[PDB]
Amino acid sequence: QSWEARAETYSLYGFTDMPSVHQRGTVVVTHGEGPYIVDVHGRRYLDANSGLWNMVAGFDHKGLIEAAKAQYDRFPGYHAFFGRMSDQTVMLSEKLVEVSPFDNGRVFYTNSGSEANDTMVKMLWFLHAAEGKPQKRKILTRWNAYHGVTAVSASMTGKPYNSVFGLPLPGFIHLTCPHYWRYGEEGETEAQFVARLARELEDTITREGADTIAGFFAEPVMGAGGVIPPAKGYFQAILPILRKYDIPMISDEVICGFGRTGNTWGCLTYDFMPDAIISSKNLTAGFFPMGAVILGPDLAKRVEAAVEAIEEFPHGFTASGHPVGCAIALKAIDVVMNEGLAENVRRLAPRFEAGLKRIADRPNIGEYRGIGFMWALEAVKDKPTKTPFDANLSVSERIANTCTDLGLICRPLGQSIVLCPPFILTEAQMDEMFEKLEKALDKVFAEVA
Amino acid sequence: QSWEARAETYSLYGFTDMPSVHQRGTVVVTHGEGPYIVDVHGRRYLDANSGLWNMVAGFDHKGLIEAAKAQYDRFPGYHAFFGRMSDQTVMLSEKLVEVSPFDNGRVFYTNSGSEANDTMVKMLWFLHAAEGKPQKRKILTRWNAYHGVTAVSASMTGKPYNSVFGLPLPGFIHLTCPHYWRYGEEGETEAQFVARLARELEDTITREGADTIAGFFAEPVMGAGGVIPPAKGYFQAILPILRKYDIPMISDEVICGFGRTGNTWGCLTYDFMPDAIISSKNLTAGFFPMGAVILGPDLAKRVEAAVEAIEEFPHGFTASGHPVGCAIALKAIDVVMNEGLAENVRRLAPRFEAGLKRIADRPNIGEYRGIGFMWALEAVKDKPTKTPFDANLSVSERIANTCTDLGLICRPLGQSIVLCPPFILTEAQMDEMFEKLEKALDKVFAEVA
Ligand SMILES: [NH3+]CCCCC(=O)O
Ligand code: NA
Ligand code: NA
């Protein structure tokens, strides 16, 4: 019984290309060092995807390892219901409101980012109903958005593949993605593009009626949708319209939270104030499953009041507010902001951007894009016309597979080659990643020209 | 700035009475010992609730503590997507199929039971759609059922409190609860009761159309709905009907999995064979957030064939199949099943019954119920007629409160008192539990009767 065999026999794989995994075998990982992972055959890889955006401190950070173990020595498990919670919970809440852009606020916990978005929607429904508008339920997101995998968070996610579940559910509207390169019109400037989306939102609000719309969620920079920075002035045009019609604005900071963008929050980087923040991933540097909904002052007041009218918030997850996870997050927050990880991103962003600009030079890259330590190259069959490769060429898989074969974990989402390495990444490691990526590109584009 | 005050300030409370957490100190917890917890001032309490059903090994178990720590030392975090996963992940999937009632099958990972129920539903929509019936979407559960708090899992839950959210969503149907004592009609026997719910199921299927019904979910014994064993023969009547009409049966084993009913699974205790299992909570003895969906032979083959047709299953949570969680799970499973914990439940269940049997003697306990290490006492004003006390006497929230005063954590649910202590409980600690409870009951029934 090999590892590959055992894996195939018992696993139902999620987000796994099945013809790749049948033909190649599951890669079974035993440990890591810095930004490297090592499999059971001893084969070693530079994971330029931070595992899954979240391992910003690498795969063996001593401080974080030591922090987790200490909390298990102290108090290994508990909950946050019935008027009881850990000291460690009370601590993170306090810490989180502080690092947040809000002056004061409140914090509710989940296990995943998906749960947090799901919770956020329910909070909105609860809130508008208690404030006299039970019909105020619709949820606005963007095409290419990714907000998670529960029925609701998947309805929030703007991707063709949710049709296999018969989603989105009624009440979830997808507006145009602010990706200027893809969706900008013949001879339309970036400013004209941003004005068209401001206009498109208002039309939607007119079409549906503000009294039926409960919220607007946005990632500051779109992550799993393939690293899409917003067109210039998007949030500046977008927010006032939402204030005008009394539509809560929620910032999904699950990827942008704590550093990847060049700041503590994506909404800092793009200079807007949300009514609430959804945080996860980096929150624990992938050491423990944690999610957080951070309500800004206005929603905090309103939710709090709404609760006391009824006497209980009948919502919550078994492991939410976990002593271990809260401890880890404190340490992770401290490590990122005070032990140089976030600054490392700001420092190396210029060089990272220089590498991609060099790489984008060839016939089959349409553009490069991103910010800080989150970036993507777009593969095209024809550059002038912007036309993608045929589905049957499986260009995405070829690139992933070839990268893996050269010792580089790089995961393309669609025809968007994504790079989101840990923050602990050294200039030499960054060179390693580029050199490996380039070879992969040469090989694949020549197979496929 | 006290602990109580810093708690109130930054925290949003889940499943918490606000009139009594504002009234009494918000209890902040530092550590534990065996089945006892210690707060920030130094008071000890016997937790007859295993934290939240899940701390079956107690709060300071040596082995689990070291297993958790050992894994942080070896590989503190990863994911299970894109053709990769940790060695821990593969061992756990193997061990879950073995330890489950299924001979063979497949495992999908979540962080919580709510996530896992939400997932199972999505799987069913996916599967039936792939097999040519996209309208097969409706989900059957029972009144009083508890399945989670995501929009979908809360819709599955049969509790009036979800109306604050405008839930249940369309498609979610609650059958009568199999609680003979409460829902048995005058003169009607238990055998007749079951016969009637059987008829109700078939009438519901006939009326909706079997092609529109995606699955049937049940807790073998209902937990957070107040510890309810099914009327005798229920699952023996329910199953044949579900099979006659091609409706997948899912056993929600989130509370009942791994020992609490006196067997490895609730479904073994009640001698029925489901099509898939939802597991969480005890899986990690509460040490880590983990959920699992274990598909039996038929649904495994069928889901895999559907995934295969489209080449990728577009579902998964970032922390799914986490290396630490799996390593911890793997250890909890071993501790419960091989180190006496499950066995101790069987050893002490008749003594547990004997205690409640005596307590239920009072004119104010209307009934005891449960099995293994999960029990309820139901409070009543008049025993002959089964009328409860008036709601405004908060007769349960008192017993819970005066219990906490006496050093016993005990959860009130409606008019009933719930006990589900850790599996490690000694005979002496069990008697301490009864001692402290009888005193609480004496004090509260004196006042209220
Ligand atoms: N956070 C999970 C990323 C999922 C990637 C995909 O859409 O293929
Ligand atoms: Na702040
Ligand atoms: Na088995």
Beta carbons within 10 angstroms of residue A175's beta carbon: 19
Best of B8, B43, B73, B90 to disrupt the A interface (most A CBs within 10 Å) is B90
Which chain B residue has its CA at the smallest distance from A169's CA?
A: B169
- Sign (positive/negative) of CA torsion B264, B270, B273, B275? negative
Ligand nearest to the CA of B296: 3
Buried b (16+ CB within 10 A) or exposed e, B344-354: bbeebbeebee
Phi, psi dihedral angles at B250 (to 5 degrees): -115, 120
Three-state DSSP state, B166: coil
Q: What is the CATH number of domain B61-341?
A: 3.40.640.10
Residues 6+ apart with CB under 8 A from A170: none
Residue B242: left if φ>0, alpha if ψ -120 to 50, beta else—which one? alpha
Sheet holding A84-86, edge to edge: A84-86, B27-33, B36-39, B44-47, B408-409
**Two structure tokens written together for A256:** 């942008």
Chain B from 196 to 215: CB within 8 A of any A CB: none
Residue among A24, A77, A314 minimizing CB distance to B15: A314
Tell me, using a 6 A CB cutoff, whether residue A161 lines ligand 1: no
Contacts A159 to B, Cβ<8 Å:
314
Cα Dmax for chain A: 66
H or E stretch at B71: helix B62-72
CA-CA distances (angstroms) from residue A166 to A115, A205, B133? 20, 25, 11
Instruction: Extract the tokens encoding A429.
Output: 């490691």
Amino acid identity for residue A137 in this structure: R
B351: helix, coil or strand?
helix
CB B388 within 8 A of CB B449: no
Closest partner residue to A114 (CB to CB) among B69, B84, B317 is B317
**Cβ(A413) to ligand 1 under 6 A?**
yes
* Cβ–Cβ contact B303 with A under 8 A: yes
Nearest to B162, CA basis, from B151, B174, B176, B178:
B151
User: Does the beta carbon of A100 lie under 8 angstroms from any beta carbon of chain B?
Assistant: no
Ligand located closest to B103 CA: 3
Contact B411 A82 (CB under 8 A): yes
Find, among B133, B132, B104, B106, the residue nearest to B119 by Cα.
Answer: B106
Amino acid at position A88, single letter:
Q
**∠ CA(A289), CA(A293), CA(A298), 5° rounding?**
170
> How are beta strands A249-252 and A213-218 bridged, if at all?
parallel
CA angle B171, B150, A414 (to 5 degrees): 95
Contact B162, B237 (CB under 8 A): no
What is the gyration radius of the CA atoms in chain A, in angstroms? 22
Element (H, E) at B93: helix B87-99
Provide the β-strand partners of residue B84.
A27
DSSP state of B205: H
Rounded to an integer, what distance in angstroms lies between the CA atom of residue B167 and that of residue A198? 32
- Which atom of ligand 1 is the closest one to the Cα of B318? 1
Q: Are B179 and B366 in contact (CB under 8 A)?
A: no
Asked if B319 lies within 8 A of A286 by C-beta distance, the reply is yes
Other C-beta atoms within 10 Å of A363: how many? 12
> Could you say which ligand is closest to the alpha carbon of residue A412?
1
Instruction: Write out the two tokens for B385.
Output: 């007629």
- Per DSSP, the three-state class of B370 is strand
Report CA dihedral (B421, B423, B425, B426) to the nearest 10 degrees: 150
Å resolution of this model? 2.6
Residues on chain A touching B149 (C-beta within 8 angstroms): 119, 122, 315-317
Nearest ligand to residue B102 Cα: 3
Cα separation, A164 vs B123, whole angstroms: 10
Distance B274 CA to ligand 2 centre (A): 50
User: Which candidate, A256, A258, A422, places its Cα nearest to that of A331?
Assistant: A258
Residue B325 phi, psi dihedral angles, 5° rounding: -45, -50
Q: Do domains B1-60+342-449 and B61-341 have the same CATH topology?
A: no
Give distance in angstroms: CA of A96 to centre of ligand 2.
Answer: 7
Cα distance between the two ends of chain A = 40
CB contact (8 A) between residue B118 and residue A150: yes
- Cβ pair B83, A27 in contact under 8 A: yes
Asked if the C-beta of A114 comes within 8 angstroms of chain B's C-beta atoms, the answer is: yes
Chain B within 8 Å of A406 (Cβ-Cβ)? Answer: no
Query: Which residues from A are below 8 Å from B76, CB to CB?
Result: 59-61, 64-65, 68, 287
Tokens of B408: 């016993």
Strands B44-47 vs B408-409: parallel, antiparallel or unpaired: parallel
* Contact (Cβ atoms closer than 8 angstroms) between residue B412 and residue B418: yes
Task: Let me know: does A359 contact A368? Beta carbons within 8 Å.
Answer: yes
Residue of A20, A115, A146 to test ligand 1 pocket, by largest number of atoms within 8 Å of CB: A146
Q: What is the dihedral of CA B270, B273, B274, B277, to 10 degrees?
A: 70
Q: How far apart are CA A149 and CA A224, in angstroms?
A: 12
Residue B199: strand, helix, or coil: helix
Ligand 1 atom closest to Cα of residue B312: 8
Is the minimum distance from the CB of A15 to ligand 1 under 6 angstroms?
yes
Of A315, A326, A397, which to mutate for an interface test with B (greatest number of B Cβ within 10 Å)? Answer: A315
Quick one: DSSP state of residue B221? S
What distance in angstroms lies between residue B55's CA and the mean position of ligand 3's atoms? 24
Residues A441/A378, Cβ–Cβ less than 8 Å: no
- The answer, for B318 touching chain A at a CB cutoff of 8 Å, is yes
CB neighbour list of residue B177: distance below 8 Å, 6 or more residues apart: B142, B143, B144, B145, B158, B183, B222, B225, B228
DSSP-assigned beta bridge partners for residue A376: A369, A418
Tokens standing for A36? 């490297």
- The two tokens of residue A161 are 């593949």
3-class secondary structure, B121: helix
Domain ranges of chain B: 1-60+342-449, 61-341
**Phi-psi bin for B82: left (phi > 0), alpha (psi -120 to 50), beta?**
left
B297 touches chain A (CB under 8 A): no
* Contact (CB<8Å) B30/A68: no
Instruction: Answer whether B315's CB lies under 8 Å from A15's CB.
Output: yes
Q: Do residues A138 and A208 touch, judged by C-beta distance below 8 A?
A: yes
| Ligand 1 centre distance from Cα of residue A413 (Å) | 7
Q: Classify B186 as helix, strand or coil.
A: coil
Bridge partners for A27 per DSSP: B84
Q: Which method resolved this structure? A: X-ray
Amino acid at A133: K
Q: Tell me which residue has tokens 């939270």.
A: A257
Residue A384: how many CA atoms within 13 Å on its side-chain side? Answer: 0
Sign of CA dihedral B438, B442, B445, B448: negative
**Closest ligand 1 atom to the C-alpha of A113?**
1
Q: In B255-340, which residue ranges form alpha helices assigned H by DSSP? A: 266-269, 297-310, 323-338
Architecture in CATH of B1-60+342-449: Alpha-Beta Complex (3.90)
Strands B172-175 and B213-218 come out as: unpaired
Can you tell me the distance from the alpha carbon of B339 to that of B332, in angstroms, rounded to the nearest whole number? Answer: 10
Q: Pick from B1, B29, B169 the residue to mutate for testing the A interface (most A CBs within 10 Å).
A: B29
Rg of the Cα atoms in chain B: 22
Pairing of strands A138-142, A213-218: parallel
Q: Which of A9, A29, A62, A97 to mutate to test the interface with B (most CBs of B within 10 A)?
A: A29
Nearest residue CA, atom 7 of ligand 1?
A: A224
Buried (b) or exposed (e) across A414-429, using 16+ Cβ within 10 A?
bbbbbbbbbbbbeeeb
Whether the Cβ atoms of residue A12 and residue B127 lie closer than 8 Å to each other: no
Contact pairs from chain A to chain B, CB under 8 Å: 390
Among candidate residues B9, B28, B314, the one with its CA nearest the CA of residue A159: B314
- Chain A hits for B285, CB-CB cut-off 8 Å, are 77
Is the separation of the CB atoms in A418 and A352 below 8 Å?
A: no
Chain B residue numbers with beta carbons less than 8 Å from the beta carbon of A105 are 10
CA dihedral A96, A101, A105, A106 (to 10 degrees): -40
Judge whether B99 is closer than 8 Å to chain A, CB to CB. Answer: no
Report helix, strand or coil for B277: strand
Q: Do A314 and B55 touch (CB under 8 A)?
A: no
Q: What is the 3-state secondary structure (H, E, C) of chain A?
A: CCHHHHHHHHECCCCCCHHHHHHHCCEEEEEEECCEEEECCCCEEEECCCCCCCCCCCCCCHHHHHHHHHHHHHCCCCCCCCCEEEHHHHHHHHHHHHHCCCCCCEEEEECCHHHHHHHHHHHHHHHHHHCCCCCCCEEEEEECCCCCCCHHHHHHCECHHHHHHCCCCCCEEEECCCCHHHHCCCCCCHHHHHHHHHHHHHHHHHHHCHHHEEEEEECCCECCCCCECCCCCHHHHHHHHHHHCCCCEEEECCCCCCCCCCCCCHHHHCCCCCCEEEEEHHHHCCCCCCEEEEECHHHHHHHHHHHHCCCCCCCCCCCCCCHHHHHHHHHHHHHHHHCCHHHHHHHHHHHHHHHHHHHCCCCCEEEEEEECCEEEEEECCECCCCECCCHHHCHHHHHHHHHHHCCEECCCECCEEEECCCCCCCHHHHHHHHHHHHHHHHHHHHHCC
Question: Angle of helix A427-447 relative to helix A395-405, nearest 10 degrees?
Answer: 130
Q: What strands, in cross-sheet order, belong to the sheet with A36-39? A: A408-409, A44-47, A36-39, A27-33, B84-86
Q: Which residue has the tokens 């996530």?
A: B115
Q: Answer whether B177's CB lies under 8 Å from B143's CB.
A: yes
Interface check A329 vs B, CB under 8 A: no
